[PDB]
């Protein structure tokens, strides 16, 4: 499968034609305040430099494979383990976040994909309720260089080639996310890539993460994709809520 | 395992010492109002008189096998098929509901047990989040004979003996349930019988169903359990929430 160009995605996976797909346009006015939604809890995210992690240009994103041991709770009894993180970005003067807020697209978005601790394998969790959970944060232009992000953005040149990978030192994975783990939107949707399986819990942080203009440019301008062509605008079109209600952890 | 003795239930099934067990004490003023909680949808529950349904004294409860085609939705895309229903009750002048409200135990309780349609088999769904969903209603004493419950209660005498069973005409299963499908409590817990699997979504109707005194006496007084003892007080003690917030569909 390619971005914005054949193949139909439903030719690749019927699930890409489901009624309850991601990403979505978040309208904070229409979100349901749900006080049951407690602050997210992360254990094991502060990684030592060794062992190193695989950072890959899979020709769709830059993917960082996460080691065993990264535990994430959405709340009492809702336990997950981190598998990987990847990013969605645009191009020079074109934003590329997947989620939008009242129609506004942010420059980029980080996703940390997690597997429910009721499942041994991703293939058993796909399409099952709460089988996968994604933590998503918007990236916005800031005045300072983000030094958490610099550790990965500095390695992109090594993996410019489509299908290329490198080993990078472990780092504080939680430092790539906002500091506010209490304020977020939550909804049930899908993977935004084939196979677009449903039953995914999306948590979208209200607080954004700041990258320098230079970092956003390194993200959007270094990697190559399928087809002597730049890896850019790697986001799926907004999908209708189709009657789903987005919950907010805050009034 | 019998009810009200040994073997301690952990010594039958370590799962019963899980951290997120059922039933629980509902305290409506600590419940979180969650406007995302939509009215329950129950299609296919109005059964014709044939085929007949298996009704069973299994020594723990009376259990009605439900046919295929009873479809239930907790939310958009979040669908279930009914498997069976059974009851929990007390004895002469003693209540036997499983769930309590502010400490109050009701005369009896009906459980309608469903399988998520993301799972082909019950055994795949046990322990998976949202794999099983139970609809629970409290049975309270009313002036009138409940004609929906009379179809089952009139048949208890035929199956009075542990392990005996009978065939009963199709009935409207939805007629055993309260009037307002928009008003309920919901939390995630467990089976209240071994193997005490967690990941069960419990939906407890705010409104109660009314049975006559005669009918409740028939329920608690007709059936024989393990050994030569009466099948009575077939409810599990209430369990700690351990941080779980009970949600409410109504303010
Ligand atoms: C540009 O989009 C992506 O490259 C991408 C985006 C996602 S997402 N946005 O989280 O759905 C996943 S997640 C999924 C892929 C299939 C197997 C489990 C992990 C994997 C990937 Cl590879
Ligand atoms: C007195 O309790 C019961 O008789 C009972 C109570 C339940 S409950 N309250 O729904 O957990 C189930 S459900 C379950 C048991 C075996 C696995 C699938 C269905 C089955 C039964 Cl048989
Ligand atoms: Zn993604
Ligand atoms: Zn039960």
Residue numbers in the entry:
A (entry chain C), B (entry chain A): 5 to 11, 15 to 50, 50A, 51 to 54, 54A, 54B, 55 to 72, 76 to 82, ...
Sentences from the paper on this structure:
The carbonic anhydrase (CA) family (CA, EC 4.2.1.1), consisting of twelve catalytically active human isozymes, performs the catalysis of reversible hydration of CO2 into bicarbonate and acid protons. Since it has been observed that CAIX isozyme is highly overexpressed in numerous cancers, it has been postulated that compounds inhibiting CAIX may possess the anticancer activity and may be used in tumor treatment. Here we have designed a series of compounds, methyl 5-sulfamoyl-benzoates, which bear a primary sulfonamide group, a well-known marker of CA inhibitors, and determined their affinities for all twelve CA isozymes. Eight crystal structures of CA complexes with compounds are presented in this study: 9a bound to CAI and CAII, 3b, 3d, 5b, and 9a bound to CAXII, 3b bound to CAIX and mimic-CAIX (mutant of CAII containing amino acids in the active site as in CAIX: A65S, N67Q, I91L, F130V, V134L, and L203A).
The X-ray crystallographic structure of compound 3b bound to CAIX showed the structural position, while several structures of compounds bound to other CA isozymes showed structural reasons for compound selectivity towards CAIX. The positions of the compounds were similar. However, the binding affinities of 3b to CAIX and CAXII differed significantly and were 150 times stronger to CAIX than CAXII (Kd_intr = 0.030 nM or ΔGintr = −62.3 kJ/mol to CAXII and Kd_intr 0.20 pM or ΔGintr = −75.0 kJ/mol to CAIX). Again, the side chains interacting with 3b in CAIX and CAXII were different. They were more hydrophobic in CAIX (A203, L135, V131, L91, and Q67) and more hydrophilic in CAXII (N204, S135, V131, T91, and K68). Nevertheless, the native CAIX bound 3b 10-fold more strongly than the mimic-CAIX. The strongest binding ortho-sulfanyl-substituted benzenesulfonamides, especially compounds 3b and 4b, showed extremely high femtomolar intrinsic affinity (80 fM, corresponding to very high, 120 pM observed affinity) and selectivity for tumor-associated CAIX.
